[PDB]
C-alpha cells in the first residue's frame, strides 16, 4: 500500500535549540525496534541512514538567532534528501533531531507535492520570525520561514537564502497548543491560521478536533498530508524526555487518535518525529517511556489500529 | 430491591493463564471489605462461598492450549453455581480468578436467563478459538466457546463437552479494546460484533459509548444484562496488579461511568470482576490501588453514585 | 480592564477543618509569584493584605460542630473586607484558608452584588447543616449557611448570628462532585440545585458542562459571577497537598477550561482559591505541584489563555 511504503531519514541535528542530546533521537528510535515493528505491520521500509551534518565552526548569531548557518544547511540538505525519498514514491519519515529541521522536511516535501497540507502536533506554534523570537532558538521559528503570508517579514538570515515559502496560512492546522509567545499569538490570529489549542481539545473532544482538521484540509479536494509531530505535543507524563515540555498536554490516547485518523485518510505523504532527547530523562525509564510513545505514535501513522489488524486471509481455516 | 440483591461466588482459579496469583483475587477483594461495603449500600447479600477447584493431574495440553481439563472443569462447576444463584432470584457476582471463568459464568446465567445481553469491558476481545490462539491461554478464548455463530468452528477440547453456545454475535458489546489478535480481529469483523475500541471511546466519549451500548442491547425491550469486567480494561495507572496490562486504557472515571449507567437500567443480572492479580503489584500500594478500583467498580454496579446516595428518610427533620 | 482589576485578600484560617497547615495557603501562593504573574498579564493588582485572625480560647463545640466562634468571626471579618474590595470596583481574590470562609467571601460579595450567581468547584457539596454534619467540620457546611431555602434549618450557632442567607438554590452550580454525604445528597435533590458531579462531567465532557453552567446562570440576564474554587475538585494527581483528596477528580486541563470560560464571560466578580495545605504534600514536589496548579487556575480566571495572549500592538511592525 502507498500508505505503508516508507523512506526513513535520520536527521541527528541539535543546533536549532540549546540542549544537547536531541541528535541521539534517530539512534534511540532505531534501537527501540521501529524498522522491525514497521515491517511486522506489512510496511515496505527503506532506510536512507543518518545525514552527516558536517561541523560549521564559525557560525556567529544573527542578532539573537543562534547557529543560523548550521540550522540553514542542515534543513537545506534535509530538503534534498526528503525530495529524493518523495521522488522514489515513499512516505518520508524524518527522525529528528530538533523541530528546526521542519524547514527542510516540508520545503523538500513541497518540491514534489506543492499542494500539501500540514498538521502540526505540538505544545508550541514554532512560528516566531527571526525578529519576533525571544529565545533566539530556530526550532521555535520553522513555520515563519515556510509561510507565503510572512514574505517580507523574514530578514536575510545566513544559511537561509535557499528558502522560498511553500505553504499558505490556510493549509496548516495546529493541534496541542499551550505555550505560545505573544509575537506568535499575534501572527496566529492575524493570519487566521486554523488551530486547536488544549482549550479547543478540552471543548470539542479529540473526535471533533480530527473531524474538523481533516475537513478543513481535505474538504475542498484530496491532497497529500505532512504530519509534523513534536513529542512535546503530548503531556510530559508520556514524553518526558524532551527539551521544552509543557504541562497539561495531549494524552497517549489522544496522540493515537490523531495518527489513526490521519492513517485512515490514506493521504499521509510525509512525517516528522521530532524533539526526542534521550539525554533529558530524569531516570532511565522516562527515556524508554518517551521513545516507546514516539514509536507507538509512528506505528499508528502506518496502520496500527487499537481495534486490531488482520491480513486478507481466512483465520478460521 | 432486585438491582441490589446479590449472590457472591468466589472463583479462586488461575489455570486459564500462566501467571500465578490471580487465584488470590477473591481473597483480597473480600479482605478489602467488599461484602460489608455492599451491605452498607442497602444490598441484600448472600455469600455462596469460594468454589473448590480440584487439582487435575496429567492435565495435558490440547495442541498449544494449556490446562484444558482444569479450565473446563472450573467453568463447569461455576456454571452450576451461577445457575443456583440465578434460581434464587439474585444477581450472581463472580469474584475471579482469570477470565476463562466467563465460560461458566455466562453459560450458567443463560440457563436461567437465555435472553441475556453481554457487556464485555476489557483491553482484549478474548474471542480466540483453540485453533486461532497464539498464546494458548484459555483466558483469551471464553467468547469463542459461548458464541452460537462459532458452533462447528471450535474443536472438541477435553473438559468442554458440557458447553453449549448460549449467545449470538448480536448479543454482545465490547468496550475498551486495544490489544486484539489478527484472528480475533478477523472474527470480530466477519461476525459483525458491536465494539467500542479505545479509538471509539476517544472519538465518541464514554457518554455516547454507554448511550449506544444500552440502546443496542435494550432498544427492542428490557432484557437481562451480564457485565463481564476484566480489570485490564482500565489503564495500568489504575489497575496495575493484573496479568496482561495494556497502556492507554479506560480511565478510573470511565470505568465508574460504565457501571453507574448499567446500574441505572435496573437490569444488571450477572457480574464478573476478573483478572485481579495481587502478586503482580510492583509495590504493595499498586495492589491496594488495583483492589480499591475493582471494589469501586463493583459498588457502582449496585447503586453507589458519585453525585451521592441517601436513605429514603427526611434528613432535614 | 475590569475583568483584570483585582483585590487580593489573604485569609490564613484553618479552624473550619481539623488538619493544621491550611492557614499557610496565602503565604505559599504569594511566595509562588501570584501577584507578579497577574501583573505580567496586564492586571491591576492591589494587595489588601492578610486578614488578622485573633485566637479564641475556650471555643466549646456546638453539639459536634467544632470551633464555631472562630469560624463565625473569621467569615464575619472576611465579609467586611470583600464588601470593601467590591465597593472599590475590584474583583475580590480570597487566598484560603479552608472553605468555611466562603460564608464570609460570598456574604460580603452579595452585600455589593446581591444578584450574583455562584459556580462551586469542589469534590464536595459543603452543604451540610450544623444538624446534618457527621464530621462536625464547618468547611463542609458553608453552602447551607448561605442558602435562603435552608433558613429555618440552620440552628443558632455561636458566632453566626451576623449571617443572613444571600443565595437561592437556583443561583448556584456545582462542578466536580464525587464525595457527597447522604444528608447533602438529600439537600441537593430536595432543593433541586443544578450540579455537574464527575458522572455528568464524564457523560458530557467539560465543554458541554461549561456551556450548560453558564447558560443556566447567565441565560435569564447578565449577572456577577462568584467562583468558589476548592482545589480538591481536581484529582489528587494534580493537587495532592489538600485536606480532603478524593480519587477520580477533574483533570488539570478541565480546571483550566472551567476558568478560561469563566474569564471569557467578562463577568467574574469574586474568586476564592481554597484548601491549599502546604503541610500535606507527601514530598516537597507534591506541595509545589498543588501550589503551581492553584496559581495556574488563578491566572486563567484573569485572562491567561492556552492559545496564547498578546498586547494591542503590531508585533510584525
Ligand atoms: O520560541 C521558542 O523558543 C518557543 C516558544 N517559547 C515559549 C517560552 C516561554 N514558556 C513560558 C512558560 C514556561 C513553563 C512551562 S511548564 O509547563 O509550566 C513547565 C515548567 C517547568 C518544567 F520543568 C516543565 C514544564 C515554559 C517557557 C519562550 C522562551 C523560552 C526561553 C527564553 C525566552 F526568552 C523565551 C519561547 C517555541 C519553540 C520552543 C519554545
Ligand atoms: O489470547 C491471548 O492470550 C490474549 C490476546 N493476545 C495479546 C498478546 C499480544 N500483546 C501485544 C501487546 C503487549 C502489551 C504492550 S504494552 O501495553 O505496551 C506493555 C508492555 C510492557 C508492559 F510491562 C506493560 C504494557 C501484550 C501482548 C497475544 C500473545 C501473548 C502471549 C504470547 C503470544 F504468542 C501472543 C495474545 C487475550 C487474553 C490476554 C492476551
Ligand atoms: O462534611 C464534610 O466534612 C465533608 C464531607 N465528608 C466526606 C467524608 C466521607 N468520605 C467518604 C469517601 C472517602 C474516600 C475518598 S478516596 O478518594 O477513596 C481516598 C481514600 C484514602 C485516601 F488516603 C485518600 C483518598 C473520604 C471520606 C465525611 C466524614 C468525614 C469525617 C468523619 C465523618 F464522620 C464523615 C464527610 C465536606 C467537606 C470535606 C468533607
Ligand atoms: Mn514544542
Ligand atoms: Mn516544535
Ligand atoms: Mn479478559
Ligand atoms: Mn484482558
Ligand atoms: Mn470545599
Ligand atoms: Mn472539597
Amino acid at each position: 500500500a502507498k500508505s505503508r511504503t516508507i523512506g526513513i531519514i535520520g536527521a541527528p541535528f541539535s543546533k536549532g535549540q540549546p540542549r544537547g542530546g536531541v541528535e541521539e533521537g534517530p539512534t534511540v528510535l532505531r534501537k527501540a525496534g521501529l524498522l522491525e515493528k514497521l515491517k511486522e505491520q506489512e510496511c515496505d521500509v527503506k532506510d536512507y541512514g543518518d545525514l552527516p551534518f558536517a561541523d560549521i565552526p564559525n557560525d556567529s548569531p544573527f542578532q539573537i538567532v543562534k547557529n543560523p548557518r548550521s540550522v540553514g544547511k542542515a534543513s537545506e540538505q534535509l530538503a534534498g534528501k526528503v525530495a529524493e525519498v518523495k521522488k522514489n514514491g515513499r512516505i518520508s519519515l524524518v527522525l529528528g533531531g530538533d523541530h528546526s529541521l521542519a524547514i527542510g522536511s516540508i520545503s523538500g516535501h513541497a518540491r514534489v507535492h506543492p499542494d500539501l497540507g500540514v498538521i502540526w502536533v505540538d505544545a508550541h506554534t514554532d512560528i516566531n520570525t527571526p525578529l519576533t523570537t525571544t529565545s533566539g532558538n530556530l526550532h521555535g521559528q520553522p513555520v515563519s520561514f515556510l509561510l507565503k503570508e510572512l514574505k517580507g517579514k523574514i530578514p536575510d538570515v545566513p544559511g537561509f537564502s535557499w528558502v522560498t515559502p511553500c505553504i499558505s496560512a490556510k493549509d496548516i492546522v495546529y493541534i496541542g497548543l499551550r505555550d505560545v509567545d505573544p509575537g506568535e499569538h499575534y501572527i496566529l490570529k492575524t493570519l487566521g491560521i486554523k488551530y486547536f489549542s488544549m482549550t479547543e481539545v478540552d471543548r470539542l473532544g479529540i473526535g471533533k478536533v480530527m473531524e474538523e482538521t481533516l475537513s478543513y484540509l481535505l474538504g475542498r479536494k484530496k491532497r497529500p498530508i505532512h504530519l509534523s509531530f513534536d513529542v512535546d505535543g503530548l503531556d510530559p507524563s508520556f514524553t518526558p524526555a524532551t527539551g521544552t515540555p509543557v504541562v497539561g498536554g495531549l494524552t497517549y490516547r489522544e496522540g493515537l487518535y490523531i495518527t489513526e485518523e490521519i492513517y485512515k485518510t490514506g493521504l499521509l505523504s510525509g512525517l516528522d518525529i521530532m524533539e526526542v532527547n534521550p539525554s533529558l530523562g530524569k531516570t532511565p525509564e522516562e527515556v524508554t517511556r518517551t521513545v516507546n510513545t514516539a514509536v507507538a505514535i509512528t506505528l499508528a501513522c502506518f496502520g496500527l489500529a487499537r481495534e486490531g489488524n488482520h491480513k486478507p486471509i481466512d483465520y478460521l481455516n
Side-chain angles (χ1 to χ4, degrees), chain A residues 171-218:
Chain A
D171 301 298
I172 186 173
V173 181
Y174 284 112
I175 304 165
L177 313 175
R178 62 191 184 275
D179 187 7
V180 183
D181 289 353
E184 290 183 283
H185 191 249
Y186 174 82
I187 300 158
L188 184 74
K189 301 295 302 220
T190 57
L191 298 194
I193 291 163
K194 186 76 169 165
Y195 63 91
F196 299 94
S197 73
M198 296 313 302
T199 300
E200 281 68 62
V201 182
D202 290 343
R203 177 180 301 116
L204 303 169
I206 208 69
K208 202 81 204 71
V209 165
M210 289 316 287
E211 199 186 316
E212 292 189 34
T213 299
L214 301 169
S215 178
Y216 179 87
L217 291 170
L218 310 166

Side-chain angles (χ1 to χ4, degrees), chain A residues 12-149:
Chain A
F13 178 78
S14 64
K15 292 187 162 177
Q17 56 80 64
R19 317 185 89 176
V22 74
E23 76 281 352
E24 297 314 316
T27 312
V28 183
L29 291 166
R30 284 153 189 262
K31 276 166 182 179
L34 189 66
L35 275 86
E36 298 96 320
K37 285 168 166 70
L38 280 160
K39 279 179 251 197
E40 273 161 20
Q41 216 168 277
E42 302 312 302
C43 297
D44 174 2
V45 183
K46 179 178 176 173
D47 174 31
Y48 292 81
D50 294 343
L51 280 162
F53 300 113
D55 196 63
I56 297 167
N58 306 72
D59 181 17
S60 61
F62 171 76
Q63 311 188 347
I64 199 95
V65 179
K66 305 135 182 61
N67 321 308
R69 298 152 141 104
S70 298
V71 176
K73 194 53 79 172
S75 268
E76 190 178 5
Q77 294 172 168
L78 182 58
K81 185 53 77 181
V82 165
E84 178 188 330
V85 176
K86 285 319 298 169
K87 280 149 190 165
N88 291 335
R90 292 180 174 279
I91 293 169
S92 51
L93 168 48
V94 167
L95 309 179
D98 75 74
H99 224 172
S100 73
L101 296 156
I103 300 165
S105 191
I106 295 157
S107 299
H109 187 183
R111 266 173 221 177
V112 184
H113 304 296
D115 59 341
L116 55 87
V118 176
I119 302 164
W120 194 282
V121 180
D122 202 332
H124 308 99
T125 35
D126 294 346
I127 204 172
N128 272 303
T129 74
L131 308 174
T132 73
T133 191
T134 49
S135 68
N137 303 320
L138 272 156
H139 80 142
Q141 306 167 51
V143 189
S144 75
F145 281 86
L146 301 165
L147 298 170
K148 297 176 164 193
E149 294 71 15

